[PDB]
């Protein structure tokens, strides 16, 4: 629920509308929360929906090419992307550099992504890092290929974006108006072999060059 | 205190003030310049 | 471009104080949080400087 | 000192500042929302 | 009208320090005075107040 | 003189306008002389245009809802201010007794 | 909080990865002295990891993780020490922008 005073929106709304700015910032925060929930939700999150047979541990802590190949062996039918913390990306780059195997890069959404075996590695700050340990996630997406898909509710009342709506609720005797901003989301895995998790990824190990 | 909404001081940072031209207090109607004929 | 030589950068203060509710399962009838977005009261202002001869 | 012309501080009272929309430091590219298909 | 609720009244300070030269007779070749018009650095600002019920 | 359907006493050509809002305490009141206008650097009033729910310029009415007692509420707001462009546009005469009477013998 | 030191003095790939971790949201370019470019090239050669190049403004720029490295003689070099700068530009992405005054006389 977003609270806006009527005086503030009445007086200081030139050249920027105050209610519009408040709604925009609230919607950005809500979308960041949605991105966090699609990974960390205890019911439909990616880390919770992975089966024990699709989860493996690192051979020696650090993320190495061998570990990524082992992770690929589990989702070998058309992988889409990797997902990890930026610190995990740096650790994987260090491990690749130590072995003299520089991976190429690709351009997507105005960014540069490191690819391993042709599969891009995408960073995300919502992947938890605890005690210097993080996770790697390999995912196949699509309904036609029986992958992982997102769910949303269309045709909402007050819809701004597909799955998000804003509704005016009234004024509360203090000349303060309120708005209700709601979003509905879920995540479905069509087949078990469309998702895998690599666990125990240390991100604080460094090599020596004498 | 715990405010329930955005305050005026923070909200006024996004708004333009209405500025007047400088006001001169020594300006007089100068009736003599209008009462005389000029050759 | 700067229309009159002064550029003001407005910023959000305390982004972690925006409270959101997300349900894990079996939604209830509990009251929702009420919040707002706060701004910095003394934003940094840039004024153009001259290089001349 | 005796200034020869109008200063910047007094002259800026007649000028409008260029104001940006508030900048949120927690905004991320949110690649996961773009990589997934939505049903 | 006030576009955003704030009204600033700019005023000239020290109007007696503007120097002018007027000749009474038989003009000479003396240097002219040099001056400018000064403004108040902290003008009074008006903000609208509410009457409501 | 005739103005707004009324008759105003004028002194030196300047009308005298009555108003019950001028305070009267202990039998004393005040006289106010005012010059108005932006071109003449006088006294002006300020208002906010383009309000949501505007009825008259500077006044708006908004519906707020119903309060579980089948009673509806409305918010009526007005914003105003007064600015003096130059100091010599306003003067006040104080200590005006209004309870003195003369005799005609 | 956005400034770090080199692990062992010379600019190594690990140092550039650590710098990238701070500006991980869409970096634009690196900026350093040409001597820094030569030192980074030497350190890359020692580990056998030759970086690719890109063409921009009629020049050839070494790229690291897809981010070009741009030389500039205005970056100070004192006592054989220089600096590396990573920058994101743009108003839509809340980056670094330059300001100028339009409509000047003459």
XYZ file of C-alpha atoms in Angstrom:
605
model
C 0.000 0.000 0.000
C 1.406 3.366 -1.116
C 0.476 6.531 0.800
C 0.565 9.971 -0.851
C -0.473 13.216 0.828
C -2.944 15.268 -1.200
C -1.142 18.544 -0.442
C 2.173 17.243 -1.811
C 0.591 16.068 -5.066
C -1.464 19.270 -5.314
C 1.368 21.773 -4.870
C 4.696 20.294 -6.023
C 3.606 18.547 -9.246
C 5.455 20.714 -11.792
C 7.309 19.735 -13.921
C 7.335 16.207 -12.420
C 4.155 14.526 -11.199
C 4.666 13.287 -7.638
C 2.200 10.379 -7.751
C 3.722 9.113 -11.004
C 7.231 9.121 -9.518
C 6.083 7.367 -6.339
C 4.254 4.720 -8.375
C 7.258 4.197 -10.661
C 9.662 3.684 -7.757
C 7.216 1.374 -5.960
C 6.773 -0.684 -9.142
C 10.550 -0.973 -9.553
C 10.853 -2.210 -5.964
C 8.006 -4.681 -6.545
C 9.684 -6.066 -9.671
C 12.976 -6.480 -7.802
C 11.030 -8.364 -5.124
C 9.507 -10.580 -7.827
C 12.967 -11.369 -9.205
C 14.115 -12.220 -5.671
C 11.088 -14.469 -5.089
C 11.469 -16.389 -8.354
C 14.813 -17.621 -6.977
C 14.437 -17.721 -3.184
C 10.765 -18.578 -2.582
C 10.458 -21.686 -0.351
C 7.475 -22.935 -2.406
C 8.052 -22.172 -6.106
C 11.646 -20.917 -6.115
C 14.319 -22.359 -8.374
C 16.472 -23.479 -5.435
C 13.530 -25.261 -3.769
C 12.107 -27.036 -6.836
C 15.391 -28.798 -7.674
C 15.313 -32.515 -6.894
C 18.123 -34.122 -4.850
C 19.207 -36.215 -7.850
C 19.770 -33.024 -9.886
C 22.063 -31.399 -7.286
C 25.834 -31.918 -7.135
C 28.758 -30.612 -5.091
C 31.989 -29.017 -6.256
C 34.991 -31.320 -6.538
C 37.393 -28.959 -4.742
C 35.278 -25.967 -3.712
C 36.077 -23.536 -6.506
C 33.938 -23.494 -9.683
C 36.017 -25.211 -12.358
C 35.323 -26.180 -15.992
C 34.953 -29.798 -14.855
C 32.151 -28.816 -12.465
C 30.320 -26.937 -15.221
C 30.666 -29.918 -17.571
C 29.247 -32.168 -14.844
C 26.346 -29.740 -14.420
C 25.791 -29.730 -18.195
C 25.606 -33.536 -18.185
C 22.391 -33.288 -16.113
C 20.552 -30.810 -18.382
C 22.211 -31.972 -21.597
C 18.979 -31.566 -23.613
C 19.204 -27.947 -24.854
C 20.378 -25.838 -21.894
C 19.467 -22.156 -21.926
C 21.641 -20.254 -19.437
C 23.582 -20.376 -16.194
C 22.720 -18.228 -13.186
C 24.991 -17.237 -10.303
C 26.249 -14.294 -8.248
C 28.791 -11.886 -9.802
C 31.369 -13.149 -7.295
C 30.801 -16.630 -8.711
C 31.399 -15.253 -12.205
C 34.683 -13.731 -11.024
C 35.728 -16.996 -9.353
C 34.927 -18.997 -12.494
C 36.903 -16.508 -14.575
C 39.868 -16.874 -12.225
C 39.678 -20.669 -12.472
C 39.485 -20.484 -16.276
C 42.465 -18.111 -16.354
C 44.551 -20.463 -14.204
C 44.110 -23.202 -16.833
C 44.687 -20.929 -19.841
C 41.248 -21.410 -21.414
C 39.674 -17.981 -22.062
C 35.952 -18.311 -22.813
C 34.294 -16.168 -25.498
C 31.490 -13.679 -24.867
C 28.089 -12.874 -26.366
C 25.906 -9.759 -26.480
C 22.376 -9.893 -25.050
C 20.152 -7.087 -23.715
C 22.970 -4.558 -24.031
C 25.375 -6.583 -21.878
C 28.326 -8.947 -22.308
C 27.971 -12.504 -20.997
C 30.682 -15.124 -20.576
C 29.679 -18.367 -22.296
C 30.796 -21.900 -21.452
C 30.263 -24.521 -24.176
C 28.037 -21.969 -25.912
C 25.779 -21.433 -22.871
C 25.874 -17.894 -21.408
C 26.543 -17.274 -17.722
C 24.153 -14.632 -16.374
C 24.817 -12.772 -13.092
C 22.192 -11.979 -10.484
C 22.500 -10.418 -7.033
C 19.525 -12.430 -5.726
C 21.582 -15.650 -5.649
C 22.579 -15.932 -1.969
C 26.195 -15.920 -0.812
C 26.775 -17.258 2.706
C 30.186 -17.830 4.323
C 31.804 -17.242 0.936
C 29.691 -19.961 -0.705
C 27.270 -19.567 -3.619
C 25.346 -21.682 -6.144
C 25.211 -22.319 -9.885
C 21.895 -22.989 -11.637
C 21.384 -24.450 -15.120
C 17.902 -24.091 -16.607
C 16.054 -25.003 -19.805
C 13.078 -22.785 -20.662
C 10.067 -23.198 -22.922
C 6.711 -24.964 -23.083
C 7.508 -26.766 -26.344
C 10.696 -28.290 -24.888
C 9.144 -29.143 -21.482
C 11.307 -26.636 -19.612
C 10.771 -24.064 -16.869
C 8.099 -21.398 -17.396
C 6.685 -18.446 -15.491
C 3.003 -17.937 -14.718
C 0.917 -14.760 -14.566
C -2.729 -13.686 -14.453
C -3.995 -11.679 -17.454
C -6.973 -9.349 -17.641
C -6.588 -7.675 -14.253
C -8.660 -4.680 -13.171
C -6.470 -1.590 -13.167
C -3.741 -3.352 -15.137
C -0.614 -1.294 -15.818
C 1.704 -4.116 -16.944
C 0.726 -7.757 -17.609
C 0.342 -9.232 -14.138
C 0.447 -5.919 -12.232
C -2.441 -3.626 -11.294
C -2.920 -0.355 -9.400
C -6.182 0.589 -7.666
C -7.195 3.728 -5.771
C -8.543 3.023 -2.279
C -9.566 6.396 -0.819
C -8.570 9.117 1.642
C -8.098 8.522 5.366
C -9.285 11.665 7.225
C -5.732 13.067 7.130
C -5.877 14.163 3.460
C -3.652 11.203 2.536
C -4.612 9.034 -0.436
C -3.682 5.365 -0.752
C -3.084 3.061 -3.713
C -3.015 -0.733 -3.918
C -0.295 -2.235 -6.130
C -0.501 -6.003 -6.633
C 1.384 -8.624 -8.636
C 0.740 -12.366 -8.969
C 3.451 -14.790 -10.053
C 4.523 -18.424 -9.873
C 7.030 -20.816 -11.426
C 6.388 -24.255 -12.931
C 8.845 -27.006 -13.877
C 7.383 -29.290 -16.543
C 10.080 -31.987 -16.324
C 12.590 -32.727 -13.574
C 15.576 -32.814 -15.960
C 15.073 -29.148 -16.958
C 16.780 -27.776 -13.828
C 19.971 -28.543 -11.912
C 21.928 -26.914 -9.089
C 25.654 -26.908 -8.301
C 26.269 -26.367 -4.584
C 29.224 -25.538 -2.355
C 30.809 -22.973 -4.686
C 33.626 -21.111 -2.931
C 34.270 -17.600 -4.239
C 37.246 -16.538 -2.101
C 40.109 -18.666 -3.480
C 43.077 -17.195 -5.361
C 46.032 -18.696 -7.219
C 49.726 -17.793 -7.238
C 51.994 -17.015 -10.209
C 55.698 -17.217 -9.360
C 8.111 10.946 14.385
C 7.309 8.198 11.875
C 5.819 9.953 8.855
C 3.148 8.167 6.829
C 3.928 9.858 3.498
C 6.522 11.978 1.721
C 7.138 15.374 3.293
C 7.029 18.817 1.726
C 10.746 19.551 2.129
C 11.795 16.415 0.237
C 9.057 16.800 -2.388
C 9.892 20.438 -3.175
C 13.294 19.370 -4.556
C 11.483 18.256 -7.737
C 9.505 21.476 -8.310
C 10.269 24.777 -10.031
C 9.787 28.026 -8.132
C 8.089 31.029 -9.725
C 10.677 33.809 -9.993
C 9.862 37.479 -10.509
C 12.022 40.094 -12.204
C 13.890 42.240 -9.641
C 11.748 44.931 -8.028
C 13.168 48.454 -7.795
C 11.851 50.464 -4.847
C 13.011 53.821 -6.263
C 10.639 53.703 -9.250
C 8.173 56.608 -9.261
C 5.297 57.369 -11.666
C 7.339 60.285 -13.104
C 4.341 62.472 -13.904
C 6.488 65.427 -15.003
C 7.876 63.504 -17.983
C 4.296 62.827 -19.133
C 2.931 66.327 -18.457
C 5.524 68.126 -20.608
C 5.609 68.412 -24.387
C 8.859 67.496 -26.124
C 10.326 69.388 -29.091
C 22.239 19.879 -21.944
C 21.800 22.166 -18.945
C 19.395 25.042 -19.529
C 20.785 27.484 -16.944
C 24.128 26.079 -15.805
C 22.807 24.228 -12.729
C 22.227 20.462 -12.650
C 20.504 18.827 -9.669
C 20.685 15.057 -9.139
C 17.810 13.791 -6.985
C 18.318 10.502 -5.147
C 16.238 8.098 -3.071
C 17.305 7.744 0.574
C 16.925 4.524 2.577
C 15.754 2.169 -0.215
C 15.592 -0.695 2.313
C 12.712 0.936 4.230
C 10.204 0.240 1.442
C 8.235 -2.701 2.837
C 6.651 -5.312 0.566
C 4.574 -8.386 1.405
C 4.949 -11.650 -0.512
C 2.973 -14.761 0.396
C 4.556 -18.208 0.314
C 1.310 -20.178 0.489
C -2.333 -20.178 1.640
C -2.949 -16.433 1.676
C -4.590 -14.867 4.732
C -6.562 -11.730 5.643
C -3.752 -9.867 7.422
C -3.264 -6.096 7.031
C -0.876 -4.934 4.315
C 2.192 -2.757 4.966
C 1.975 0.967 4.236
C 5.061 2.735 2.883
C 6.380 5.560 0.707
C 9.563 6.540 -1.138
C 11.775 9.138 0.554
C 14.072 11.643 -1.159
C 17.300 13.328 -0.114
C 16.645 16.826 1.230
C 20.061 18.194 0.138
C 20.807 16.733 -3.306
C 24.145 17.397 -4.959
C 24.074 20.258 -7.470
C 26.497 20.645 -10.385
C 27.388 24.014 -11.909
C 29.320 24.300 -15.164
C 32.919 25.528 -15.008
C 34.748 27.540 -17.642
C 37.828 26.763 -19.731
C 38.782 29.933 -21.580
C 41.634 32.018 -22.973
C 36.382 43.544 -2.254
C 34.653 45.974 -4.620
C 33.134 43.864 -7.388
C 32.911 45.309 -10.894
C 29.820 43.366 -12.000
C 26.990 41.206 -10.690
C 28.087 38.006 -8.976
C 27.026 34.434 -9.635
C 25.266 33.920 -6.295
C 22.945 36.897 -6.804
C 22.425 36.157 -10.507
C 21.450 32.517 -9.936
C 18.323 33.612 -8.029
C 16.702 34.328 -11.420
C 17.529 30.981 -13.068
C 15.850 27.571 -13.113
C 17.837 24.495 -12.124
C 17.653 21.277 -14.136
C 16.081 18.614 -11.913
C 16.304 14.877 -12.531
C 13.807 12.223 -11.483
C 14.937 10.417 -8.300
C 17.614 7.787 -8.886
C 17.162 4.374 -7.265
C 20.425 2.585 -6.481
C 18.765 -0.829 -6.025
C 17.676 -1.104 -9.672
C 19.221 -4.114 -11.425
C 18.940 -5.234 -15.072
C 16.734 -8.169 -13.948
C 17.906 -10.562 -16.651
C 15.919 -13.499 -15.245
C 12.593 -11.794 -15.981
C 13.672 -11.403 -19.624
C 15.177 -14.888 -20.031
C 12.018 -16.750 -18.964
C 8.893 -17.383 -21.014
C 5.564 -16.476 -19.427
C 2.391 -18.566 -19.737
C -0.995 31.917 -10.537
C 1.820 29.896 -8.982
C 2.833 26.849 -11.006
C 4.292 24.748 -8.174
C 3.238 26.418 -4.925
C 6.424 28.475 -4.434
C 6.640 32.200 -5.214
C 9.986 34.018 -5.084
C 10.131 37.825 -4.985
C 13.479 39.145 -6.231
C 14.530 42.612 -5.077
C 17.308 45.092 -5.820
C 19.663 45.844 -2.916
C 21.362 49.214 -2.383
C 19.633 51.233 -5.146
C 21.650 54.311 -4.102
C 24.950 52.734 -5.216
C 24.079 53.035 -8.918
C 26.202 55.996 -10.014
C 25.131 58.305 -12.845
C 26.858 61.340 -14.352
C 24.916 64.426 -15.437
C 26.642 67.508 -16.827
C 25.499 71.005 -15.899
C 27.409 72.824 -18.638
C 30.439 72.754 -20.965
C 31.003 69.003 -21.099
C 34.519 67.649 -20.559
C 36.547 64.519 -21.363
C 36.481 62.968 -17.882
C 36.064 59.205 -17.356
C 32.529 57.913 -16.836
C 31.409 55.956 -13.754
C 31.118 52.175 -14.002
C 28.327 50.441 -12.083
C 25.927 47.493 -11.978
C 22.642 46.501 -10.331
C 22.883 44.183 -7.320
C 20.286 41.644 -6.181
C 19.375 40.227 -2.788
C 21.015 36.840 -2.236
C 18.231 35.541 0.064
C 14.914 36.708 -1.417
C 11.681 36.056 0.436
C 9.806 32.973 -0.781
C 6.052 32.435 -0.417
C 4.457 28.987 -0.241
C 0.702 28.493 -0.478
C -1.174 27.451 2.666
C -4.283 25.298 2.848
C -7.794 26.031 4.107
C -9.699 22.753 4.132
C -12.372 20.689 5.868
C -18.673 56.034 -5.834
C -20.474 52.941 -7.130
C -18.638 49.605 -7.161
C -19.954 46.019 -7.107
C -23.487 47.233 -6.421
C -22.465 49.246 -3.350
C -21.772 52.861 -2.383
C -18.287 53.666 -1.077
C -17.169 56.863 0.627
C -14.029 58.218 -1.037
C -11.300 60.389 0.477
C -9.093 62.264 -2.012
C -10.539 59.973 -4.685
C -9.608 56.733 -2.877
C -12.636 54.630 -1.833
C -13.047 53.362 1.723
C -14.161 49.719 1.798
C -15.699 48.081 4.900
C -14.867 44.606 6.146
C -15.986 42.803 9.298
C -12.718 40.823 9.406
C -10.742 43.886 10.554
C -10.437 43.317 14.321
C -11.955 45.739 16.823
C -10.597 45.391 20.368
C -11.342 47.718 23.300
C -13.059 50.123 20.915
C -10.025 50.436 18.623
C -9.530 49.342 15.012
C -7.106 49.858 12.120
C -6.977 51.561 8.730
C -5.142 49.916 5.826
C -4.055 51.579 2.573
C -3.026 49.237 -0.240
C -1.760 49.473 -3.819
C -2.470 46.408 -5.966
C -1.014 45.084 -9.205
C 2.051 43.390 -10.684
C 2.881 46.157 -13.167
C 2.946 48.747 -10.357
C 4.836 46.541 -7.848
C 1.871 46.343 -5.477
C 0.192 43.646 -3.391
C -1.047 40.497 -5.141
C -2.771 37.264 -4.170
C -1.505 33.811 -5.115
C -3.367 30.630 -6.049
C -2.615 27.197 -7.490
C -4.137 26.483 -10.926
C -4.932 23.139 -12.516
C -6.147 21.266 -9.447
C -7.795 17.844 -9.528
C -11.510 18.137 -8.849
C -11.464 21.894 -9.396
C -14.751 23.751 -8.914
C -13.435 27.336 -8.782
C -9.862 28.523 -9.472
C -7.950 27.539 -6.350
C -10.666 25.312 -4.838
C -11.294 21.600 -5.374
C -13.729 18.956 -4.116
C -12.859 15.248 -3.942
C -14.906 12.215 -2.908
C -13.263 10.070 -0.224
C -15.601 7.127 0.423
C -18.166 5.703 2.839
C -17.435 4.923 6.485
C -19.402 1.761 7.427
C -22.246 3.990 8.665
C -23.632 4.839 5.194
C -22.127 8.331 5.515
C -20.170 9.745 2.579
C -17.342 12.244 3.003
C -15.973 14.982 0.755
C -12.661 16.839 0.908
C -12.816 20.563 0.102
C -9.471 22.368 -0.114
C -8.225 25.852 -0.972
C -4.665 27.185 -1.234
C -3.899 30.887 -0.901
C -1.139 33.353 -0.070
C -0.371 37.066 -0.275
C 2.804 38.704 -1.593
C 3.990 42.303 -1.220
C 6.310 43.239 -4.082
C 7.563 46.524 -2.586
C 7.501 47.752 1.002
C 5.916 51.127 0.153
C 2.763 49.481 -1.261
C 1.139 48.936 2.154
C 0.621 51.081 5.252
C -1.370 50.752 8.475
C -2.908 53.401 10.747
C -3.255 52.162 14.329
C -5.045 53.292 17.475
C -8.312 54.228 15.748
C -10.945 54.886 18.408
C -14.508 54.368 17.183
C -16.520 55.427 20.245
C -16.097 59.224 20.313
C -19.009 61.597 19.689
C -19.263 65.362 19.235
C -21.739 67.850 20.691
C -23.758 70.544 18.894
C -25.049 73.170 21.326
C 34.007 1.871 -1.278
C 34.486 1.720 -5.071
C 38.311 1.854 -4.976
C 40.571 -1.202 -4.707
C 44.300 -1.925 -4.806
C 46.241 -4.342 -6.981
C 46.976 -7.760 -5.506
C 50.669 -7.780 -6.475
C 51.259 -4.415 -8.154
C 50.960 -5.394 -11.802
C 47.527 -5.299 -13.498
C 46.414 -8.923 -13.782
C 43.181 -10.496 -15.079
C 42.153 -11.128 -11.461
C 42.371 -7.401 -10.701
C 40.209 -6.563 -13.718
C 37.643 -9.179 -12.675
C 37.585 -7.649 -9.185
C 37.043 -4.224 -10.763
C 34.227 -5.638 -12.920
C 32.523 -7.044 -9.818
C 31.962 -3.452 -8.630
C 30.371 -2.134 -11.855
C 28.802 -5.444 -12.865
C 25.635 -3.728 -14.163
C 26.483 -3.037 -17.837
C 30.051 -1.677 -17.924
C 31.010 0.499 -20.881
C 34.798 0.862 -21.123
C 38.087 0.850 -19.258
C 40.398 3.864 -19.169
C 44.130 3.871 -18.448
C 47.492 5.109 -19.672
C 49.054 3.360 -22.701
C 51.806 2.076 -20.398
C 49.054 0.405 -18.380
C 47.755 -1.189 -21.579
C 51.243 -2.532 -22.300
C 51.593 -3.863 -18.745
C 48.198 -5.581 -18.910
C 49.137 -7.104 -22.261
C 52.387 -8.408 -20.783
C 50.533 -9.940 -17.831
C 47.989 -11.543 -20.176
C 50.816 -12.926 -22.324
C 52.541 -14.447 -19.288
C 49.408 -16.504 -18.548
C 48.772 -17.425 -22.194
C 45.355 -15.757 -22.475
C 45.351 -13.473 -25.549
C 42.357 -11.115 -25.507
C 40.432 -10.269 -28.692
C 40.171 -6.779 -30.203
C 37.389 -4.527 -31.485
C 37.211 -1.655 -33.978
C 35.967 1.751 -32.816
C 36.594 5.258 -34.194
C 39.239 3.926 -36.573
C 41.264 2.279 -33.797
C 41.838 -1.197 -32.358
C 40.944 -1.710 -28.692
C 41.853 -4.677 -26.513
C 38.756 -6.027 -24.764
C 38.535 -7.914 -21.470
C 35.324 -9.901 -20.905
C 33.857 -7.942 -23.818
C 34.644 -4.506 -22.331
C 37.131 -2.465 -24.410
C 40.214 -0.892 -22.845
C 40.738 2.682 -24.052
C 44.078 4.526 -23.700
C 44.450 8.139 -22.635
C 47.584 10.168 -21.928
C 45.704 12.306 -19.375
C 45.659 9.461 -16.824
C 48.540 10.389 -14.486
C 51.569 8.133 -14.085
C 53.693 8.874 -11.007
C 56.646 6.767 -9.817
C 55.684 4.101 -12.346
C 52.145 3.847 -10.944
C 48.897 4.523 -12.816
C 45.169 3.852 -12.412
C 42.395 1.852 -14.061
C 38.881 3.291 -14.363
C 35.671 1.399 -15.170
C 32.666 3.515 -16.144
C 29.025 3.008 -17.121
C 27.522 5.816 -19.209
C 23.978 6.904 -19.980
C 20.931 8.602 -18.469
C 18.555 5.659 -18.943
C 20.941 3.349 -17.053
C 21.804 5.868 -14.288
C 25.432 6.141 -15.385
C 27.969 8.936 -15.824
C 27.096 11.846 -18.123
C 28.722 15.066 -19.283
C 27.056 18.474 -19.105
C 27.206 21.461 -21.454
C 25.430 24.777 -21.977
C 23.457 25.094 -25.240
C 22.451 28.233 -27.102
C 25.567 30.322 -26.527
C 26.280 33.638 -28.239
C 28.979 33.230 -30.864
